Amino acid sequence: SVNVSKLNVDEFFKDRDGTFILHDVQKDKTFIYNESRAKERQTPQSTFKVPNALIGLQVKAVRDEYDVKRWDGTEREFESWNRDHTLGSAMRDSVIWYYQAMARDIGEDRMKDWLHRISYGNEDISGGIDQFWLQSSLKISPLEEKDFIEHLYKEDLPFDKPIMKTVKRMMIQEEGDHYTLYGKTGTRLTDYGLGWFVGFITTDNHSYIFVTNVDASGTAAKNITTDILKKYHLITN
Numbered sequence: 001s002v003n004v005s006k007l008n009v010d011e012f013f014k015d016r017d018g019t020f021i022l023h024d025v026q027k028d029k030t031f032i033y034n035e036s037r038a039k040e041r042q043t044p045q046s047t048f049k050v051p052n053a054l055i056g057l058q059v060k061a062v063r064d065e066y067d068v069k070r071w072d073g074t075e076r077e078f079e080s081w082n083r084d085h086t087l088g089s090a091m092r093d094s095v096i097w098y099y100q101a102m103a104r105d106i107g108e109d110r111m112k113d114w115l116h117r118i119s120y121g122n123e124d125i126s127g128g129i130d131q132f133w134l135q136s137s138l139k140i141s142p143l144e145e146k147d148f149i150e151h152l153y154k155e156d157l158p159f160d161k162p163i164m165k166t167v168k169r170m171m172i173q174e175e176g177d178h179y180t181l182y183g184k185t186g187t188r189l190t191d192y193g194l195g196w197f198v199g200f201i202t203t204d205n206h207s208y209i210f211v212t213n214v215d216a217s218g219t220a221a222k223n224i225t226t227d228i229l230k231k232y233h234l235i236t237n
Contacts, residue, residue: 001206002232004031012224018214020228021146025153025200025207032143041121041139042213045186046094047196048133050152050167052103053087055114057163061105062087065170069098077189088170094185094218100130117158120148135188142213145198150209153200171199173222178236179203183210183225185218195221201234208234 004024010033013020019037023030032038056062065088075082080093090098103111108129115123121140125132132138140148151157155164171182183199195218200209210229212221229235 002234004029004208007031007033007228007232009033009224009228012227013214016214016216016224018212018216018221018224019142020224021142021209021211022228023146023150023209025150025209026205030146037213038142038211041141041144042194043135043188044121044133044138044140044145045135045188045194045196045218046096046099046133047145047184047186047198048138049091049094049099050171050184050198051115051118051120051148052099052106052133053091053167053170054152054157054159054163055111056087056102056106057166058114058159059106059110061102065166069101072097091170091184094187096134103130118148118151120144135190135194142211145196145213146209146211149198149200149211153207153209173199174235176235176237179234181226181229181235183222185222187218192217195219197221197225199225201229203234206234 004022009020019034021032021038066086068084068086070084081095085095085098111125121144124137127136155161171184173183174181180202183197186196188194193215195214195216197212212225214221
């Protein structure tokens, strides 16, 4: 099994400004590439869909991963956004409008209370109930994102356990024969100059929490992550 203290990911960050964090759950060891950036609080983008979904389910703003919100008919920038969505499909396709509707239903008071309860970054929602995670007031460091995802993995958060199971299932990106990859991307869609992929991977007898944060798109962040996990024989088939 991989010894994360001996990782090297230099080849995947050439000509990039990024950080990579990998935590071995069973061996309780953490590798960090670019610790300075790992400590820098940044806007979470669609990585906020993870805590947003937990809170929205917990307060019954939405019923389950299948809660349908009908598309209003307005053509938006991405084709995948221009159809009816559910909590789960809107996570998979980063459908901002769905999560904005849910955030408005959660409301400022409950959102503030929950972000304080889970100590999510600077907890700053002053940018607006349906805007604060989108290159706005809320900021969280890559290491803080790793801690949050690790708490979700271990279910050391103050949510009902079935809600945490549901949201983790909504994060499934690839279900192979020998591994399951969970994750959420985020991108700053103005310049595509801030990108995230946060999540975890399970194999037989091993699991790992990861965060990639980079001066590129969320897709680039995800591809860097999967390249690293493949290199170390965690993503196989």
